[PDB]
């Protein structure tokens, strides 16, 4: 089936929606269908915002970019455990480690991935360079995976969803899933 | 002293608890005793799984098995956390990064790590490689540790809690304490 | 401008305090005032502590020694969280890395990384060896970084809190900082 992907850029004042766009159409080989979103960092506007695409237009998957850091302005991982369901703590925490590869800084991000309803909301980075370091992790110069990117385990999660059976490009990430789950 | 484990498998629907039993029985050089349960995925009765094993039967430890993931059901990790007194935020991490070793959806775990008097309570993976992997760690061709396994700091943490005195075998995994708790 | 530091010893029953004042007079080039506290560890004390040196004293980063374990009396990590406006999740994360490189038994610590007001709050471990290894992190025989300690993103968190510019000797520690933060 179709993907439904609901992307979210969160601006404090865009490149955020076109390196998701980009890297979303490089990584995936069946079909998906975009919802974009260009708002302020205003919590109760990102709460609604994440609300109307999981429960009125019913993304699987929703990706977020910006507002993740220690800045009293930096609300997106707050709003997104409010509307969550579940916490799924592996995100956030792998994220961060991905994202430690290459700055220290890192651990500075307070981003989280989360469960509501049957969607995964994942929060990523502001800049188009990390949105895609954190996607596709970090490689050698052959090519051999060194840290997996986050992506590699979204295939499976949405099929342990209840989500569209979902592939993509080896060259960029592979989906990894267990003998059990593979078509 | 006798170290009390409780072993839970928690079925959706057995091997979760004979592969504790294997392992711990090639792991353990101090005496132990087991209280085995297996249950249906349904919180509540995991919950109170949980406590008949701390309150009446006083396990120094319990071991779970099964319904760690994302998926609707999987609810082993908010009963392990409803029944806790207090969190240890480490063990949930570091057993995804050691199951992070071995394939990249170790992050779609919400296992924990909590304490519920003076009762350390884990949770495992399901499959019995999962447990044994999580439990011992990784090591290299000629037997090494490259990845301490979660067991490593198990003996010296039943220790602070006022717990017997548990030692390992070595060749299995050898039990980290400080000089302070040496006997 | 001068960073107010505030040092906070947490003794169960002093080698915290001191351990503090000789690692930062090393690692910061830019002046720094010191605010000294020596404590048990009973929690509403601590919490008071705390709340004393970021809101009488506007300290902008308050380092705690001790306490952080599983045994019953550790209660610095719980004092933190109840004075946070909000948690910083990649701290005690990675404060837990760092240390694993040490002894697998860094799993054991709770301690986490908070903001109160505009201040960051960080709780390290008792020994003044740890206090050490996590600040500054684990280089090779020749100096070079292996995985950068956690001060590596304090003067920069600092920074987006709205408090002074610091700046580290890069013999001791790096200060990292995107283009868009270098003065």
């Known amino acids: 089936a179709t993907l439904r992907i609901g992307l979210v850029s969160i601006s404090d004042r865009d490149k955020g929606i076109p390196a998701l766009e980009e890297w979303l159409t490089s990584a995936l080989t ?4 975009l919802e974009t979103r260009l708002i302020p960092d205003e919590q109760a506007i990102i709460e609604q915002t994440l609300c109307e695409l999981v429960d009125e237009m019913s993304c699987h998957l929703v990706l977020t970019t910006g507002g993740t850091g220690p800045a009293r302005r930096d609300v997106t991982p707050d709003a997104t455990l409010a509307v969550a369901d579940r916490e799924m703590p592996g995100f956030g925490e792998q994220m961060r480690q991905i994202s430690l590869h290459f700055v220290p800084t890192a651990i500075l991000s307070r981003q989280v991935g989360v469960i509501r309803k049957q969607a995964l909301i994942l929060n990523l980075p502001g800049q188009p360079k990390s949105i895609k370091e954190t996607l596709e992790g970090v490689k050698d110069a052959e090519g051999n995976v060194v840290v997996h990117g986050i992506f590699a385990s ?8 209840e989500g569209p059976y979902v592939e993509t490009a080896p060259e960029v990430v592979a989906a990894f899933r267990p003998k059990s789950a593979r078509r």
């Not at 069946?30 to 269908?33: D, G, K, L, S, V």
């Not at 979204?154 to 969803?161: E, R």
């Open 154 to 161: 979204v295939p499976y999660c949405i099929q342990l969803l």
């Open 30 to 33: 069946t079909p998906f269908e």
